[PDB]
Structures are given as structure tokens and as C-alpha cells.
Design a protein around this ligand. Structure first.
Ligand code: HEM
Ligand code: HEM
Ligand SMILES: [Cl-]
Ligand SMILES: [Cl-]
Ligand code: NA
Ligand code: NA
Lengths: 714, 714
């Protein structure tokens, strides 16, 4: 097999994750805009076709109970269910279930069949509906078909054309149980961040119980922890699990050894499908997906209150499925559950270990009893939590498309108030920038503050950014990386400038504090250019609004805290992963290419954006002037670098002839002089003909960051 | 470490090689044109800087004999020396020595020092001179400075910003001796295609002899074989080796275990340098590079004919360097060779085993004696060989920039005559297209002929393409893929149309056969569109010229024969590599992305472009009509695919319900319905809204292919 750079240097840094998703891999034109296509779709027509499909059984994967609805609910719920709150990565929003590795994860077994049943609709409507939107809409139509009224639905998830680079864990074996050489668990069952599943290739938890031990109480612990890591609390979790398991069935009709290769390993003749089974007919009555053989309710194709009636109305006995999996059966019950294919056959109620957790964990039991006693509350909670599940990674409501978008504003959507007044224009922005610069705020304060406000954005789930002025709220105002005391001084001076500008206006014109933060950042960048002898205008677009503290969930904001921000040379503690790996990870969440990451970091260093005014990487003698000094001095072969005695992650730069100390830096600084691709970029900006390019490229990337969350202007 | 798709499915096909070189990874703006920048460089000022640098020693890597010339000649010969004729990949043309893996190959040890000595000049001239051109120019200036007249120099190698994907071999250990589990040799020392070096991480051969065995005669076999695979014959090989080894020295002052990590494995503080040595001062007189310790001539900083005077004026004794390497010393000679740092110390003549090859291989010996006796013949040969070496991957002479380009047209350049007459205009091209269609030639003939002419292009060394009409000449006219009897019938009809059009003109206007083949291909694609109910114009740009047989080296053209062309569903024999891997390899040589590859193949299928009118992949009932039928039929779940009995690489597609035979295909056809990323592309073009998109994208990629070699219009 051809040996690659990854084989020879398996811990060198990987920049290809910044250049994924180029116009090269994209079949659509560079002008294609999915939102526009979707806004012309006849959504009602698509939903009529999806309703028809529900009961149009295909012989190559016959519909249980004559209705694919359960299968499609699972499909939708797995699409959404890869989401991790720690980085925003996963979720339904890019349709990644159709690409490796998720198309071939064990927990996604036979979802390949679900997707292929949808090809005719996809084909008929073409680019006007993405796969990503289709997987979610199909889940919704399955619910409606079976009698459950959904809370609504938004389109606008554009398709992607290759796999996302996501850390799913370090195990080398599918479904490996914990405590191995790459265990994702340590200590008292502590799941490593950013992971949100208990075994490699599962969505959340193991349905037999933790590492296969069928203890519902301990399974509950894993459920609570994973679902929390997917942004779901106890009420939402119980509602989702019981709601989902109101429908359909599991599949475990014989031994697992009968099941063949997952899709990415199957032969070319399988045409993109996998898990071909040698057990009896391989499908339908003989299907094997998970190994469990459980049908939860007496009407699997219809919404009912039967899941909690069974859960609490029987006592449960441990038993084994025909594949050998642990599962539970109702003591003394009659055979009341219908068979999926034989009208003469009925079954006793059965449950997964993880279903019983809803009854035997003390906190879930109280919610489950309440939903049992008050089924209208169960229905409303499940509808809401299904909407959250399937929309949690879509970002601000400004991105939601179509006629079924719920009007209700939810807290998890980090809502921004509407703007209801005239915005400031170019003359006003010049006047405000002059006031900011006359107040005595420094280039370093102005740039650091705007950076702090805007760089919480992540492209993974489209959360964060400067819109909202949440930097002035709990918890962002207290984050160590934001320099709380310095921040508090900047915000007070800005709030006074604001108050005075707004008080002098006629009409209703006013400026938001969100805009003014970003504008003042722009004024600092202009001033820094002036300090370097360059006349530069930084673009600015108004229209941000200020969100209140009550519109800002403090516990949900915690995951946006930067614990590593190489752009401010900050690391909150010691991590296993080297700090340059962390930098490229942050660049990816910010949507930056390598050239953009390089320009941006070089500029920020010389503008004074480091936390604590650390001199590390400040390779200039004219701090607060916008120059390419970082690059020119980094690349100077006059200087020799060595790790310090005290700290092997800090390096001193000394004159090679005299021995004299010139600089210090971190790993994030020096990686630009080390990595052969980054140093090629640094060379371009460190050349003699590059000062104007460096300024212009810096302003462009600064502006890009300031507008990351500006979906009102998209 | 993070487990990746490559880990789980290490034999899946890798599309990412088609999406390198995106505007994402490029720090220059999308409008930057290197040739425009280079054309304004003051090349004489760069050469005067380089000339000064040759004798300006830096203490971190002191210059042997006070002169860096030998070091820089070796740098330039290794930049160029990775070139393989089999695929055109490697060579100096993209400056790849500064990226992985080449930057860290053992045979490139201490060239990192060379390149860092050139940073200050790079920095001074910035974007107007690429690293790629500078590596070469430096070698030239080193030669000039030491009294050798070069044949010339062309600029125009644009820099690249990431590593090329290249197969360098399958070994997992650097320098692994042959016969291991991934041996690049089989049979009677047969080096596998497309390799051109004897061990992983070597440029050509092992300087101690084959797998370390110090036998000059057997070493000569490895020399001849590898240089041939780099397009150099015996005369050129002797001239290059003896020419190079007229200068400088090797470095092996102590044991190799003193040498540390190569650059890609070194610490971040090494700032992109590697091979730090613990032996005495680690550099200058104590340097260790190869392990050998040989100084070939009595004036290592001056051109001379002393290499052959020594080679033939002494007898040679096998000896060991201070690092333990085999090398050879002159029996009973005086100490006449100067020491590199101590003017009081002198040495006996020494040689590598591979130097002695030039005397003890009987064919090389006759050339080496001729060069010994006639050193002006040696100087001319070396100059010409050095130009060829350092230009062989640059492409057509229309790409050569600057004031030192040699006027002599060389046969290896596959030269195209100048055009000295008015070109046809749009009205003429319309008239010719109508004439071609009225002659009775079919869509299938016209498309297959144009495809065959244009698709010889490879972007690795920019050889091939339709310019020259070499399709009408030996050897192309007889290549099996080109269907020689059908080809000859087409070309005769086209040549009569040409003769009649050119006979009717006034005023010098005429059309070349090269242009008319391309134009006729365009007429075929228009008619196929017409046949599908679509009026399109395919662009066409005239200006191709016809090359003669005498301007066509037949042996050199052999490497351009397509032995696997998935775009014509063609495989000349059985290869170890699956046919789909070969398809992606061809797409990369054609410079296509994955969407361009997918569109083009789908279209070609339904236009009748398959070799031999094979029905494999012809998934249409309206052959010669430009439609998206390939995709619609491939993606139809009504059809079930199975490998045939006779041949496991050919599949039958049968109706799932009736069993009726609908189609047959190869691996190349069915990969588009298997691989998860290619199927996502196929889905776009197989959608109900895609007919217009399909046509337009097909026309665009067709025209791209037709113009691949049109650097006269760049
Ligand atoms: C602790 C969380 C959960 C666990 C451990 C889990 C486990 C499973 C398993 C093992 C199956 C059987 C797969 C098969 O063999 O075909 C399955 C089926 C299913 N699950 Fe879940 N589940 C979880 C949560 C959810 C959620 C949140 C939903 C939706 C809101 C959901 C909806 C479904 C449905 C509809 C099916 C049936 C599919 C069919 O009829 O083909 N489950 N579940
Ligand atoms: C059979 C082909 C070749 C072999 C095996 C060979 C081998 C080597 C070796 C082992 C070294 C010493 C590396 C070190 O210790 O510093 C070297 C040096 C060098 N080679 Fe070659 N070589 C070959 C062909 C070439 C050619 C084609 C050229 C250029 C036309 C060239 C130019 C040089 C020069 C100039 C040096 C001296 C470097 C210095 O002064 O630092 N060689 N060769
Ligand atoms: Cl993702
Ligand atoms: Cl290459
Ligand atoms: Na996400
Ligand atoms: Na090449």
C-alpha cells in the first residue's frame, strides 16, 4: 500500500481539515445558493410524496407492519444524534450520514436502506431539497403519518460533498468496550471531551447497558451524561426516548455472525448498501440490525400512550434475543404486541435495558410517571424536544426557511431581538469611530475586545459570534480568556459613548452595543494601520442587536468558552493535545483557511491581542502598529530558538552570534517557522514586497471574523 | 491518535488527490499571475546576489572550501532528480523539495541548509521569483561562478503550497533494502513502475552499490535503469554524473548514529531544519550527510576535466569512510586533493562505487574515454544534459520565460512549429463544423478521435495534448487505445476537408489538422446535444500547429500511451491496482476534479467513446445523444448488479423483479454507484432537474480537456 506523509510523521499537524469543502469538490456552481432553491420548492408536494412512500413497501427491504415510519424516525433521530455540544460537531445539519464513517457506523446499520428508499423523491425534486433537509423532513412526515403532530420544521441545511473531519475517538476497534489502550473513559466513568457517545460507532449509549452489563440504573448514568453532552436535560431525554420508542421495533432475528460487511467495506456490486445478511431471507421478518428483538407497543404504527402503560404495568425479566443480546420481557403478560409480518403471531411486551432506565433511575422515574399520568404533557414535551433535536445545529433563526417554521422563540436558539429602528449610516460610523479613538482606549484594548466578542463563533453548529453583545453578559464577561477586569473597563467606556450617541439622535436611530464593540474593533485596526504609516478603511456592517440575560442560557454558553485560543496565545490548562493542534481546530471552527489563519495570527500578535499582554510571539518593536513584523522576525535565521528549562512549551529566541535574548514564544508562535506548509505561508507575508498584501489580507480576514454570524445579511 | 476513514477502510479509493491545489490553500490572490510577476523581475540582479552568496559563508553551515557552489548544484540536481518518465510526476517544476516527504528524504539530508541560505534572496525578490525557479537558477549561478558555461535558463515554475500526492513506493522503512514485504523489485531486478529509484528515499541509486554491495559493474545496471526512467540515455547519464562530481565533496566525518531527526520529525525549535549532528561541531569539517567521505577533484570550486583524469589515471582500492560506508581510494597516489577547511591538510583522490561505474561498465567506459580525451565534448554534453534535467517537466516552450531561454529547439521538448498565417475565425469554424457533420462522420467517431488526441496530456510534466496533431504520427496512430484502423479512416476524411478548405482560401489563411481534429470533436459534441434536443455551442480556440515525424521522438512518446483509460472503459492488460484507482490517477493527470471526472465519464459513455464500441457502461437507449442517462440508469434501484462468472471485473445489471438483463459494466462504471462520495456526485447529475446542468458542465469539461496544453493562450 502507497506510504503517505501520515505514515511517516503520524503526529505532524494536519492542515487538510482547513481546506475541505473547496469549490473543487463541490458539484454545484460557485454561485448556487441553496436557500433560494429551497424557497422555490413545493414543500407540500414533497410531503405528499413522503406520505405515499410510508406504506409503499419495496421487496428488497420490506416495511415492518406495512409502514416504514419507525425506520424513518430512527433515521432522522440518528442523523441528529451525532451532535456534541462540546464542539458543535455532528448533527443533522450537513447530511453527513450519507458519507463515511457515519454511513457505516454499527449504530447506523440498515439506515442505508432508509436512505435508498428516499432516492426517488430526492431525484424528483433535485437541488431544491437537500439530503440533509430530506432526512429530517422524512422523520417529521413519519410522525405525522402515524398520528403525532409536530412542532414544525425549518429547511436550509445545505448539502456537503465530502466527509467532515471530526474526532470520534481513538479506538481502533468498532464498539470497543471501555478500558482498552485507547479508552475514551478514565477515572469514575469520565467520558473524554469532546466525545458524546460511550463506544466507537454508537450514537449515545449501548442498549444492553454500560459495556454490555444489563443494569438499568447504571445505564441511566450513561444516558444522562451523553444526552447532556448533546444539550438535552432529563425532561427532554425521557420525552425523546419514550416518544421514539412509541413506534416501530428493533431487529435481532438471528445471530449477528450472519451479517456482512458495512457499506464502506462492501463489494462494488452492493452499490452503496451494506450489512447484507445470510439469515433466512436477510430482511423483513428475518432482519438483523442491532441484535435486540423488542417491539414496544401494541400499535407500533400509531401514536399511543402505551409505552409508559407497559413500562409501569408490568414487572420485567432479563432474557436474551435470538442474536444473544440482553433485553427484558414482561412477567406474566399475554401476547398482545403484534408481529410485523404474520397476522397470526403475537408477542409479549418487551423493553431494552435503556428503556427500563426511565423507570429505575429515580429522577427519570418522576418524569416518566408524570408523562404516564399526563399524556398531553408527554406529547407536548416530545414535540418540542424532537424540534430541538433536529434543529439544535442550525444556528440563528435567521437561517430557518420555509412555511412550517415555528413562531415561538426558544431559549436554546440563543435568540437575538429584532431590530426595530433605523441603523447607523457611514457618517455616523465615522463619528463613533472618532469618539472611540478620542476616549483613550488603546489599539490593544479595542482589538482584544472585538476579537473576544466575535471569535466565540463556530461553523459547526453556527453558535456564537458578536451579534447579541453577549460578551457583556454572564458567563462570557467572566471568562478568563476575555480578561474580565480589562473587558469591564472597555465596556464601560463604550456604553458611555453609546449612551451619549443614542441620546443625541432624532427619529428612533440608535446603535446597539454589539455593533459598537465591532465598530470600535474596526477603529483600532484603522488606528494600528495609521501607526504603521498606512491609510486603511476597515469595512463595517451595522444591524447587530443586544440580547438580554434572560435570552442567554448560562449553562449552554459554557461550551463556547475558549479554553485554547492560539489567536490570543492562550491556554487555560495543560491538555494532552499539542497547542498547535488546538489552533488549527479553532481555525476550523472559525471557518478559516490556512493562509487566513496565518495572516490573522501574525496581525493579532503585533496589535496586542495576547491575553495578559504576554510578550510571547510579539516579534515587533512597534506594538500596536499593523505591520508584517511577526513574519519577518520569525523567519530571521539570525535567531536561534530553544525550549526553556522551566517550561518546554516556551521557547527563547537568541541572537546566534551574541547569545542575547531577543524574543520568546510558544508552540503556537513557532509552528509558523516549523511546519513546512505553514512556513511557506509565513514566507509570503515575510517578504519585502508583502507589507501592503499583508495589511489588505489582514483587514479582509478581520472583517470575515466580525461577520461570521451575520445570517441577517446572507 | 484520532481514528480516520483511511484507518477503517484503508483500501477505499482516495478522491482528495483531485482536490489539492484549491484556492483555499493558496496565499496568492485568485488573480495572481506568476508569469507576469517573473517577467518584471530583474533576473541579472538576482544572479548577482546569488553569485555573492556563493562565497559568503554562514557559521551555522560553513561553506566547504569557502564556496557553496557544490552544495547548491546538488540541491538543484535533487530538485530535478525525483522526475519519473512513467507518469511525469516529480521533478523541479513545482518546488516540491521544500514540502514533505521530499524535504525529509535521506538523500536530501542537509539540503534544508541549502534552502535556508537562500531565504534572504527569496525574501528580497518576493513573489517575482518562485522557490521552484530559484532552486534551479541557484544551481546555474553556482556552475557559472565556478567557470562553467550553462546552456540557458527558463523561468516560469509557479510555486505550489502543499505536497503532491505521489506514489514513491510501498515500503514502510526508509532506505529498505530490496526483497522485503514491500519490495519494489521482482524478477531479475525489475523495478516496479512508476518508480525510478532503487530504495525509498533515494533520488536514483545507492552510492555504495546495489543494496550496499560495492560492485561498480552491478551498480552500473541500477544507474542505467533509473536514469532511463528519468528520460536520460547513456551519454547524458555519464555527462551528468561526471559533471556534477567535478565539484564539491561528500560528507561523512563520523558515524551516522550521531545524526538526529529528519526535518518533518525534528522539534519545533529546529525551525524547519533537521539532521542535527552530535559529532564534534555538527557542521563544516565535521559534517555528516551521506556517510561517504569523498572529494573528487583537485579544484572542487572550479570547472575542470580532473574527474576523468583521476578516474582513468589511478587504480582504486575499496576502503571505508569514517561513518563506515564503502568508498574507493586511489592506490599509491599523492595527497593532492585539498581539504575543505585546513589549508595545511591534503588528501588522496577518492571515488564512489557509482563513480567507478563510469569506467568499469563497458558502454559507459567508451563515452567516459571520449569525454576524457575531448573535454569540450564533455562540457557541451553536460550543459545540454543539465538544461534537460532541470527543464524536462516544464512543458511546452511557450511556458519558458525570461532572457536566457535557449533558442535551439530540442527534440525532447516535443516541439510545435510556429504559426505564421491568419487563423480561422468564428464564421470559418461554423463552416468547418457543418462540413465535418455533412461528411458522414458520426458523433462517436468525432468524439473518440478528439478525445484520443487531447487526453494524452498530463499535468505532472505538461507533456501531451492535441497540439501538434501527433495522433496522426508514429507511435500514437498505432496505439491500441486509439483504435488504429478507425482512426486512420477518420483522419483521411478530415484531411480531405482540410485540403479543400485551405485550397479555397485567400490571403494565407489556413487551418491545421490539429485544430480541425479538435473542431471536429466540438462538432460531434454539438450534434450529440442536438440529437438530445439541445442547441449548444462548444467553444473552440484555434492556433494549434502540426508537428512532423522528424520533430517527434517515438521512444520518448511511449510513456504517454494510455494503458488504462477509464474514460474509454479501456484496460490494456491486468494490473495489480484496481481499475477505479487507475481512473482517479488519470483524472489527476488530466487536472480534473471529482465532479469534472464524473460528468465527463457519464457523457463519454453515452456518446460512444468506448474503445471497440463495448457496451459496458453504455446505460442509454439513445447512444450518440448527450443526455444524463448514464446517471439515471446507474442509480435506478430497479436494477440489481452481480459480477459475471467469466470475469469478476464485469458486472451484469438485471431487473430486480424479472431477472431480465438490462446492462453490463465494469468496475469503472459501477464505482459511481458505490463509492459514497462519487455516488453523491452522480445523484446530482441523475436528478430530474439536471439535464441543462449536465449539458453545460459536460461542454465545460470537454473544452477544458481540449485546451490543456494551450499555453500559447495562457
Ligand atoms: C438511550 C437512547 C436510545 C437507545 C439506547 C436506542 C436504541 C435503539 C435500538 C437498539 C433500536 C433498534 C435498531 C434495530 O435493531 O432496528 C432502536 C430503534 C428505534 N429507536 Fe431508539 N434508542 C434510543 C433513543 C431514541 C430516540 C431518541 C428516538 C427518537 C426520538 C428513537 C427512535 C427509535 C425508533 C423509532 C426505533 C425503531 C426503528 C424501526 O422500527 O426500524 N430512539 N432504538
Ligand atoms: C548515480 C548518480 C549519483 C549518485 C549515486 C550520487 C551520489 C552522491 C552522494 C552520495 C553525494 C554526497 C552527499 C553528501 O554527503 O554531502 C553527492 C554529492 C554531490 N553530487 Fe552526486 N550523485 C549522483 C549524481 C549526481 C548528478 C547527476 C549531479 C549533478 C549534475 C550530482 C552532483 C553532486 C554534487 C555537486 C555534490 C557535492 C555536494 C557538496 O559539495 O556539498 N550528482 N553525490
Ligand atoms: Cl460534523
Ligand atoms: Cl509531483
Ligand atoms: Na455540527
Ligand atoms: Na512532475
Amino acid at each position: 500500500n502507497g506510504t503517505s506523509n501520515r505514515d511517516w510523521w503520524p503526529n505532524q499537524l494536519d492542515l487538510s481539515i482547513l481546506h475541505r469543502h473547496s469549490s473543487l469538490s463541490d458539484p454545484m456552481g460557485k454561485d448556487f445558493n441553496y436557500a433560494q432553491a429551497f424557497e422555490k420548492l413545493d414543500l407540500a408536494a414533497v410531503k405528499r410524496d413522503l406520505h405515499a412512500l410510508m406504506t409503499t413497501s419495496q421487496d428488497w427491504w420490506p416495511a415492518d407492519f406495512g409502514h416504514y415510519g419507525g425506520l424513518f424516525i430512527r433515521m432522522a433521530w440518528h442523523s441528529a444524534g451525532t451532535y456534541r455540544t462540546a464542539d458543535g460537531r455532528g448533527g443533522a445539519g450537513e447530511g453527513q450520514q450519507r458519507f463515511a464513517p457515519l454511513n457505516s457506523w454499527p449504530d447506523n446499520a440498515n439506515l442505508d436502506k432508509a436512505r435508498r428508499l428516499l432516492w426517488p423523491i430526492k431525484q424528483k425534486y433535485g437541488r431544491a431539497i437537500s439530503w440533509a433537509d430530506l432526512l429530517i423532513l422524512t422523520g417529521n412526515v413519519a410522525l405525522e403519518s402515524m398520528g403525532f403532530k409536530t412542532f414544525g420544521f425549518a429547511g436550509g441545511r445545505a448539502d456537503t460533498w465530502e466527509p467532515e473531519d471530526v474526532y470520534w475517538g481513538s479506538e481502533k476497534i468498532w464498539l470497543e468496550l471501555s478500558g482498552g489502550p485507547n479508552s475514551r473513559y478514565s477515572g469514575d466513568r469520565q467520558l473524554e471531551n469532546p466525545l458524546a457517545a460511550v463506544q466507537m460507532g454508537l450514537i449515545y449509549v449501548n442498549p444492553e447497558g454500560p459495556d454490555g452489563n444489563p443494569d438499568p440504573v447504571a445505564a441511566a448514568r450513561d444516558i444522562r451524561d451523553t444526552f447532556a453532552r448533546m444539550a438535552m436535560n432529563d425532561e427532554e431525554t425521557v420525552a425523546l426516548i419514550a416518544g421514539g420508542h412509541t413506534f416501530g421495533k428493533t431487529h435481532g432475528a438471528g445471530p449477528a455472525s450472519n451479517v456482512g460487511a458495512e457499506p464502506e467495506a462492501a463489494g462494488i456490486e452492493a452499490q452503496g448498501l451494506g450489512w447484507k445478511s445470510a439469515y433466512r431471507t436477510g430482511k423483513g421478518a428475518d432482519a438483523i440490525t442491532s441484535g435486540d428483538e423488542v417491539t414496544w407497543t401494541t400499535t407500533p404504527t400509531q401514536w399511543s400512550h402505551n409505552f409508559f402503560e407497559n413500562l409501569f404495568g408490568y414487572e420485567w425479566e432479563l432474557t436474551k434475543s435470538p442474536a444473544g443480546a440482553h433485553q427484558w420481557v414482561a412477567k406474566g403478560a399475554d401476547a398482545v404486541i403484534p408481529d410485523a409480518f404474520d397476522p397470526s403471531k403475537k408477542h409479549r411486551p418487551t423493553m431494552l435495558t435503556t428503556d427500563l432506565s426511565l423507570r429505575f433511575d429515580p429522577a427519570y422515574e418522576k418524569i416518566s410517571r408524570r408523562f404516564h399520568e399526563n399524556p398531553e404533557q408527554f406529547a407536548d414535551a416530545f414535540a418540542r424536544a424532537w424540534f430541538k433535536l433536529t434543529h439544535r445545529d442550525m444556528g440563528p433563526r435567521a437561517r430557518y426557511l420555509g412555511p412550517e417554521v415555528p413562531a415561538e422563540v426558544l431559549l436554546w436558539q440563543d435568540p437575538i431581538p429584532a431590530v426595530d429602528h433605523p441603523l447607523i449610516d457611514a457618517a455616523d460610523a465615522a463619528e463613533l469611530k472618532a469618539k472611540v479613538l478620542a476616549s483613550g482606549l488603546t489599539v490593544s484594548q479595542l482589538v482584544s475586545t472585538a476579537w473576544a466578542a466575535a471569535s466565540t463563533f463556530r461553523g459547526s453548529d453556527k453558535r456564537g459570534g458578536a451579534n447579541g453583545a453577549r460578551i457583556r453578559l454572564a458567563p462570557q464577561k467572566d471568562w478568563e480568556a476575555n480578561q474580565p477586569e480589562q473587558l469591564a473597563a472597555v465596556l464601560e467606556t463604550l456604553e458611555a459613548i453609546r449612551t451619549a450617541f443614542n441620546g443625541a439622535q432624532r427619529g428612533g436611530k440608535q446603535v446597539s452595543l454589539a455593533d459598537l464593540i465591532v465598530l470600535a474593533g474596526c477603529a483600532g485596526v484603522e488606528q494600528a494601520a495609521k501607526n504603521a504609516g498606512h491609510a486603511v478603511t476597515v469595512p463595517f456592517a451595522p444591524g447587530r442587536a443586544d440580547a438580554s440575560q434572560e435570552q442567554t442560557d448560562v449553562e449552554s454558553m459554557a461550551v463556547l468558552e475558549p479554553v485554547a485560543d492560539g489567536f490570543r496565545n492562550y491556554l487555560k490548562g495543560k491538555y494532552r493535545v499539542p497547542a498547535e493542534v488546538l489552533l488549527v481546530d479553532k481555525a476550523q471552527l472559525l471557518t478559516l483557511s490556512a493562509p487566513e489563519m496565518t495572516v490573522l495570527l501574525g496581525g493579532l500578535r503585533v496589535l496586542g491581542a495576547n491575553v495578559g499582554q504576554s510578550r510571547h510571539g510579539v516579534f515587533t518593536a512597534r506594538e500596536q502598529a499593523l505591520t508584517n513584523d511577526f513574519f519577518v522576525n520569525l523567519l530571521d535565521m539570525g535567531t536561534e530558538w530553544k525550549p526553556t528549562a522551566a517550561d518546554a512549551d516556551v521557547f527563547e529566541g537568541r541572537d546566534r552570534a551574541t547569545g542575547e535574548l531577543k524574543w520568546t514564544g510558544t508552540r503556537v508562535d513557532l509552528v509558523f517557522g516549523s511546519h513546512s506548509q505553514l512556513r511557506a505561508l509565513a514566507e509570503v507575508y515575510g517578504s519585502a514586497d508583502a507589507q501592503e498584501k499583508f495589511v489588505r489580507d489582514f483587514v479582509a480576514v478581520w472583517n470575515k471574523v466580525m461577520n461570521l454570524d451575520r445570517f441577517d445579511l446572507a
